Design a protein around this ligand. Structure first.
Ligand SMILES: *[C@@H]1O[C@H](CO)[C@@H](O[C@@H]2O[C@H](CO)[C@@H](O[C@@H]3O[C@H](CO)[C@@H](O)[C@H](O)[C@@H]3O)[C@H](O)[C@H]2NC(C)=O)[C@H](O)[C@H]1NC(C)=O
Ligand SMILES: *[C@@H]1O[C@H](CO)[C@@H](O[C@@H]2O[C@H](CO)[C@@H](O[C@@H]3O[C@H](CO)[C@@H](O)[C@H](O)[C@@H]3O)[C@H](O)[C@H]2NC(C)=O)[C@H](O)[C@H]1NC(C)=O
Ligand SMILES: *[C@@H]1O[C@H](CO)[C@@H](O[C@@H]2O[C@H](CO)[C@@H](O)[C@H](O)[C@H]2NC(C)=O)[C@H](O)[C@H]1NC(C)=O
Ligand SMILES: *[C@@H]1O[C@H](CO)[C@@H](O[C@@H]2O[C@H](CO)[C@@H](O)[C@H](O)[C@H]2NC(C)=O)[C@H](O)[C@H]1NC(C)=O
Ligand SMILES: *[C@@H]1O[C@H](CO)[C@@H](O[C@@H]2O[C@H](CO)[C@@H](O)[C@H](O)[C@H]2NC(C)=O)[C@H](O)[C@H]1NC(C)=O
Ligand SMILES: *[C@@H]1O[C@H](CO)[C@@H](O[C@@H]2O[C@H](CO)[C@@H](O)[C@H](O)[C@H]2NC(C)=O)[C@H](O)[C@H]1NC(C)=O
Lengths: 140, 22, 146, 140, 125, 117, 118
């Protein structure tokens, strides 16, 4: 277990010490079963952090300023495929203001992507299309 | 369809500008 | 002209519907289960994975003994698991999946998300959905005749 | 309580009244503990509705034409986090035809995500992509 | 001819039954509930004991508020307790019997057999 | 398994065939887990029948003329000690006239003993 | 707690020492919540003994030679008036031979009175 965390038996504690994204440990031990990450400043979780733990039974993620946006799509993507659902009943959002107090496991893709896109809605392929049509105008 | 409709007019428009180039 | 499955033994009880037994017949896929089966036993067979929505057309089904089978527990097995947890929770403590060898170390119920076919949302990376495939081709046209 | 519905104390009743996706009231009362929507035209539920009622115990959603796609993901997730699962055994997918007659609570998130086809839905513009490359060859 | 009890209000929902509000009327005996009652609220009252078999002719009953009532928990109350163990078990943790003072020390659920009017078989000779 | 009623696998179907107290089979198989007795003439189940079937989960017992006195205490006590209480909501007394239409699971033992002395 | 019995705080344990009607203590102290009497020679409990504990919650009685006749009536009469049924599902008779291993909570007054008088 990393220095910011404390590994007691098969349980790991990484909460209540105000961990941010930058100071979050890069990787976790294989054998950990329960991980409590309560009371930090975690805006969103890095992709592939909680999906690489084979023995993870319950993870506590409450009491954090979760920012539900594009970068939070990973963590929610890991929430659907979980047998137990009790310790995720009251996960809340704190930003953006349009989605204040939204329960985390009840989020759709479009809602998370609306704030992800600065405003080019419906851009499934539009992003490079605008640039290249402008570029073709630029040529001739 | 719909989500490509907004750039549907845009592929053809830059395309026709290229037709002007040709 | 009984609706009974050929490699199965089915009997009709007047106040209890249709009870079918297919134990020990070496089945690999579900047989043609009729529309009024209320009990269905498949214990000790060679069943690998139930096709999704197999029991969605059988409204009266209420008991399902499926223990002692070589289950290949993966994403495709979700339909079975969510079925048991919705009807016979106790069965989750006695049914086990044979493959992969990672997941064959206990009952189906007490398995973590990783060992239970770790597939929730399949967040495939943004290199498909062929805008991207054509987007690069787009910039190729940029290098052609600017 | 909203005008189209009928409220009685804590309970709210909005069944058998031709209620559509756009005619749903924006926000039900916070205190509500049982909402019924049987026998309506609801294709899916809007996001942010079922999670704004913390006191909900049961909800009746049968006998409705549920389109099983990405927009229905907010409902299905709410269907997973319920202690009692008695009245959710008759939620069928009226559409798409790829998932005709499937019970909703047993639908994994794999099936619903694939319905709002990221690729298959859009490409009436596959010919448009071909046109981009072909007339770029014209320029080239 | 509506079947609403006189010291009560009734709301008929199209597909949820009858919601009978009897809260706060200061009653001491159960009103003559209609034969088709589904939801019934009896809080804020001064009820002492529900006579046995009160709910036996109401097939569609699904909710029953029993809080805010000074029950005299004894043998005659057992019936009510049993009902609350079969429809709304959680309500056991928020209903208290006011008298006797021996038994007014917590919710009905967390009560020993003795303080609950310890009558099993009344052996007499 | 008992001759005078149907029997499949681990389930027994003794219902809707006019079984009475005298005609009731003496005992059921040890491993049975369902005993439907709907639509019979069972006044009160003979003692030692519901405790000789340790595997019994549910027992459909409606649509019968139950008489509620000393003879019905074993069934009421059996009903009390059961996790699920779903199919036990429409069990009504038929005799004596004192306890007409009384729901069985919501009965104390004293009322049952009342019709006996 | 009496000399034959043992008291651990609020709880009182008296099992696994072969108690009998002569060895059964006259009473128990009024503050106990749970008592256990498993593994003794208790044929039946004397009247007014278990129902003299105001705070009794669970009274284990498994694995004892309960003979079901007149003398057991004060016990069964007490067992009906309990809010819980979990710890009373594995009590069985041992005599008379007519009732080898019948469940105690599911017994009838008529049987306990019939095997008593000639
Ligand atoms: C993560 O969230 C926590 C929760 O508030 C933040 O802790 C608080 O951080 C502020 C600084 O923004 C601390 O204020 C400082 O307080 C000391 C007195 O202790 C004062 O002398 C300083 O001038 C400054 O105002 C505050 O004390 C601290 N709260 C506690 C309980 O220690 C934390 O900063 C957040 N992490 C970030 C923003 O990176
Ligand atoms: C439901 O229970 C509440 C309390 O739990 C009770 O409401 C009470 O109603 C009385 C009169 O209806 C209120 O008395 C007030 O007294 C002042 C004294 O000057 C007077 O100015 C007011 O006009 C009023 O009469 C009392 O305050 C109120 N209780 C509370 C906590 O506000 C009653 O038992 C039930 N309410 C019903 C039946 O509406
Ligand atoms: C388990 O399944 C097998 C077949 O998949 C059953 O088949 C038995 O096979 C042995 C070996 O030849 C025979 O001696 C038995 O007569 C067969 N029995 C039956 C019913 O087919 C086997 O019985 C099953 N075991 C159990 C305990 O049900
Ligand atoms: C959903 O709304 C449609 C209206 O678009 C309803 O369709 C009507 O059905 C009735 C009888 O079934 C017909 O008489 C009408 O002509 C239909 N409307 C149209 C425009 O043709 C449909 O019934 C609604 N769904 C439900 C469940 O009520
Ligand atoms: C057991 O109950 C059934 C009905 O629940 C009795 O059936 C009736 O029998 C009489 C003559 O014996 C007929 O006249 C009736 O028409 C029957 N009723 C029905 C509904 O068919 C049956 O008699 C009872 N058993 C005994 C021994 O009397
Ligand atoms: C109480 O019961 C126990 C066992 O039920 C009795 O212990 C038996 O005592 C006899 C004679 O001393 C031995 O032959 C047996 O071997 C003992 N049983 C066992 C299992 O070892 C005990 O005697 C009984 N109490 C009294 C006072 O008789």
């Amino acid at each position: 277990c990393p220095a910011p965390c404390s590994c007691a038996g098969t349980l790991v504690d990484c909460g209540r010490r105000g961990l941010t994204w930058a100071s979050l440990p890069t990787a976790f031990p294989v054998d950990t079963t329960e991980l409590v990450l309560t009371g930090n400043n975690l805006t969103a979780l890095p992709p592939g952090l909680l999906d690489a733990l084979p023995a993870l039974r319950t993870a506590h993620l409450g009491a954090n300023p979760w920012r539900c946006d594009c970068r939070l799509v990973p963590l929610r993507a890991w929430l659907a495929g979980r047998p137990e659902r009790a310790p995720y009943r009251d996960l809340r959002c704190v930003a953006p203001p349009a989605l204040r107090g939204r329960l985390l496991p009840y989020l759709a893709e479009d809602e998370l992507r609306a704030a992800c896109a600065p405003g080019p809605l419906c851009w499934g392929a539009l992003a490079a299309q605008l640039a290249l049509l402008g570029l073709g105008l630029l040529h001739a | 369809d719909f989500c490509c409709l907004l750039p549907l007019g845009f592929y053809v428009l830059g395309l026709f500008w290229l037709l002007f180039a040709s | 002209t009984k609706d009974c499955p050929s490699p199965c033994t089915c009997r009709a009880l007047e106040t209890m519907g249709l009870w079918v037994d297919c134990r020990g017949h070496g089945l690999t896929a579900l047989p043609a289960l009729p529309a009024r089966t209320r009990h269905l036993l498949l214990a000790n067979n060679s069943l690998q994975s139930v096709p999704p929505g197999a029991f969605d057309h059988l409204p009266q089904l209420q008991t399902l003994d499926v223990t002692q089978n070589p289950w290949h527990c993966d994403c495709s097995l979700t339909y079975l698991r969510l079925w048991l947890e919705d009807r016979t929770p106790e069965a989750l403590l006695q049914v086990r999946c044979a493959s992969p060898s990672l997941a064959a170390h206990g009952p189906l119920g007490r398995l973590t998300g990783y060992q239970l076919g770790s597939c929730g949302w399949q967040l495939q990376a943004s290199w498909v959905r062929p805008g991207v495939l054509w987007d690069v081709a787009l910039v190729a046209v940029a290098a052609l005749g600017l």
